[PDB]
Design a protein around this ligand. Sequence first.
Ligand code: HEC
Ligand code: HEC
Ligand code: HEC
Ligand code: HEC
Ligand code: HEC
Ligand code: HEC
Lengths: 232, 204, 181, 181, 16, 16
Amino acid sequence: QLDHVDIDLTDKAAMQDGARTFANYCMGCHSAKFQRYERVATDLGIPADLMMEKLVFTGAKIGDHMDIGMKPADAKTWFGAAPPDLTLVARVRGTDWLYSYLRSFYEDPKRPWGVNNVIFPNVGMPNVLAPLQGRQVIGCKQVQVVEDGKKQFDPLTGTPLTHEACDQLTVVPKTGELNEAQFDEKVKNLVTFLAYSANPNKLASERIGTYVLLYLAFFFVFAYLLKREYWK
Amino acid sequence: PQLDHVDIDLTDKAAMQDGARTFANYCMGCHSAKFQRYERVATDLGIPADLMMEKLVFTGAKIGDHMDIGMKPADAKTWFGAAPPDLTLVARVRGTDWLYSYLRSFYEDPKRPWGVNNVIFPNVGMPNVLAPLQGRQVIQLTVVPKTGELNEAQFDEKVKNLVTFLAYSANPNKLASERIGTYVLLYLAFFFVFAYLLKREYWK
Amino acid sequence: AGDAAAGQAKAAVCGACHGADGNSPAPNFPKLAGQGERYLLKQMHDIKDGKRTVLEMTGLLTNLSDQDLADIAAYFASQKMSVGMADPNLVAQGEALFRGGKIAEGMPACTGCHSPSGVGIATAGFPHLGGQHATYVAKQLTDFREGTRTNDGDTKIMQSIAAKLSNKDIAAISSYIQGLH
Amino acid sequence: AGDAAAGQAKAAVCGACHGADGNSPAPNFPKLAGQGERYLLKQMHDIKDGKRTVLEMTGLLTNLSDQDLADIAAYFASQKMSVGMADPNLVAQGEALFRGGKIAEGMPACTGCHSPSGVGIATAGFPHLGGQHATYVAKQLTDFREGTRTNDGDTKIMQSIAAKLSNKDIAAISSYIQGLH
Amino acid sequence: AIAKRLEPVGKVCVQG
Amino acid sequence: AIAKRLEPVGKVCVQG
Ligand code: HEC
Ligand code: HEC
Ligand code: HEC
Ligand code: HEC
Ligand code: HEC
Ligand code: HEC
């Protein structure tokens, strides 16, 4: 069961925060090698000098690909699975899958890295966002009551009516920098940046396609008139 | 410059083996033969695979690997002032006569960065790496007596064998080509007679 | 899991070298404060079993049971590692190596397994690095490079990683880590 | 060019450390016998001008003129370097590194600039290596790797090459070079 | 605004 | 025959 996330690719600030998160917490193991720092800066509105100073940690040039020092074979040996390139991961898995996966890490001592994932069971990825999210466990917490889709909110306060469930992802209090909403926004910005990276032509594609479709409607009007006429 | 003619025999397995030994020991330090594989060199030279691995593969590579070297072209270009080119096809780029005259034309020239110059390749960036064998050669080229392991005849054979291996390396298909070409031409001569007779029959 | 409350009492003997709270004053002694409990327990077990050789600890852990070690590790993990200061002449190179690694040499950045802030991953056993003494960090990197320390497992994660670090790189990255937070 | 006959008399003071014929008995002192004249003269001038630092040689070459240094170099070059023995446990790795370098790491084989037998290239200034003391060769490789020795020129030939050698690689290759001939 | 948004996570305390 | 023909140039002395 995935969680929906409304990802706005026109939000430059969100994509910038996601790019910062990716450059700091993610490029240690994951590459974005099909994507250049120069294009990322141009599309996110980041000045080239700012991109160089803040997001390029590997000594690469602005026009270089987002390569990392960790080789896939070395990382496969170390983690048991190679950390895949994340340029297209939004297209491979979708944004909802990524949003649910990055928020579904929970402590699991039976696992090599002490964590497991609800979305990706027995994943070989360590919980690298634990400092932000905090300790997440499969414990008992309050969940909104639902009966055959009969979802109960509080009529007055508008907040959910909850009952205890004992197989839920609960963040241990005072264990991470960000609360649930702040970590939700962090993961949303990261997934927004990943969605941009997978499909950097989306906005331009929509604009060009709108113009193309307008032209094709015009041309269809003319071709239809030239057909129905001349068929008399 | 004037080159010395050398008669290269690509059927001489012993000569090509000696040339491969010389190339692996004295030439692969700076030059790659990266476009040919140790396995094919062993097969064409009649060298057993285990013997090839023991005697000619020094880089730790597999028998089926290209004859690559550690010296990267950029580093070598920085160090020597010129990149040592890959020598797999040098016998086709320069010819066997040019190689034979070049490897025997190194003489001592103190004005040069490596203390040597070449008659065939003036101001070449190659150090005289075969000086231990030829000896001290100075300018007409003359070898200082009692300065090299080999005499003029023995060094010429060493260069000839090395150039022969280089000649094979540039064109490893030459022997198989001449064998196949003989049969193709025999068939075409055979086919020509039937085609010629068929044409003659119809054009009556 | 260990008990930090009892570990505090059990960790008094250790505080002679590592400090009462685990923040050692001497550079050659590592800070145990704020270190991952899993990593601390693994290191203590390795030193007990000889998988990691610490001559200064000869026989100090032999009499401590598994629960005592767990309690001590929990107590030290419940503290906060103090942050040192990086050498200005070395902070740039150390920061570049830590955050970026070496693309050409294929050396990973340290920010993946050890957080960008150097806190490590406690659950995964990746040790906290930020604030650790530069001398100790350099010694550990050298030991990994030379194979002196091999308790990083069969995968040889840190042995392989440190094989790609020069002495200047080790010094710079240790200095950067000393001030990392 | 230098005169070996006069160099022998001029090189007597050196024989205290490097041996009368240039084959030093102590591992820490390099053998000068059979070394390339050009390389010997370059090292002598570098030590004179401070391009290479040899504390044990402090002031020994200041009073010697260019012709005296040339004579000493010519005398030592006319000799034959003695050959030591390689450690059996290290000869395989050292031989592999010397003859093949490192394909993956891009480290050149030493057989190019230094002959496959280690005699160097006298005219090019590439030093004779075969038979040199393993301790001295290891120290030189370590200095090149650490930048302590920088008299190899602006191209940083040996600094770049030794940057890719580990301590174990240096030890094995030094042992092989000592046994090489 | 962008610079603050893009600040690297790792902070290093330096002498002086 | 071929083994002798292909002998490496570099010879190394080894203890024992
Ligand atoms: C930002 C903190 C990160 C995001 C977002 C992702 N990663 Fe990783 N990761 C790592 C490994 C060793 C694996 C492979 C695990 C396995 O195959 O079982 C992964 C995997 C992923 C995936 C799954 C992609 C897929 O197609 O299945 C995603 C979406 C992903 N990662 C996103 C390791 C590491 C790592 C080393 C410590 C770091 C720092 C990160 N991952 C960071 C992020
Ligand atoms: C490093 C010490 C070298 C070794 C050992 C050998 N070669 Fe070389 N080679 C080297 C350099 C730096 C250059 C370029 C010189 C320049 O000025 O461009 C070369 C070039 C050659 C060539 C010329 C090829 C061409 O120009 O197309 C040849 C034919 C050649 N080298 C052959 C050769 C042989 C046979 C060697 C072993 C006996 C050998 N080289 C060793 C550097 C080095
Ligand atoms: C001085 C006599 C010490 C006392 C008392 C204790 N330890 Fe210590 N320890 C000491 C040194 C010099 C080192 C570093 C060794 C090296 O390779 O440089 C250590 C190391 C540890 C570690 C590893 C820390 C890390 O890897 O981050 C641990 C986990 C550790 N020591 C634990 C520990 C405990 C539990 C002690 C009391 C029982 C203790 N140490 C005492 C020196 C000394
Ligand atoms: C002991 C007091 C020495 C005397 C007397 C001389 N030399 Fe020496 N030399 C000495 C050492 C310890 C070293 C090695 C330095 C290092 O970096 O490890 C050297 C080295 C040289 C070299 C370089 C040789 C090489 O292989 O690169 C040369 C050319 C040299 N020394 C020359 C030299 C001469 C001419 C001397 C008499 C005037 C002489 N040395 C004396 C120690 C000592
Ligand atoms: C991937 C996993 C990595 C990465 C990319 C780096 N390291 Fe770290 N490291 C890793 C592990 C699994 C361990 C534990 C070793 C053990 O269990 O014995 C370590 C440990 C260290 C240490 C020792 C810490 C201590 O003794 O307190 C140091 C100093 C260290 N690692 C440094 C370091 C540096 C400088 C890195 C980038 C060059 C780096 N690591 C990367 C795992 C991983
Ligand atoms: C081509 C360039 C090479 C390569 C492939 C190797 N070396 Fe050697 N080397 C080279 C030069 C030009 C010099 C002179 C340095 C100077 O002028 O100061 C050297 C020197 C050395 C030395 C010093 C020997 C001594 O002090 O007597 C050593 C020990 C040495 N080089 C070792 C060595 C090794 C182990 C190599 C393969 C890993 C190697 N070299 C390759 C030029 C070149």
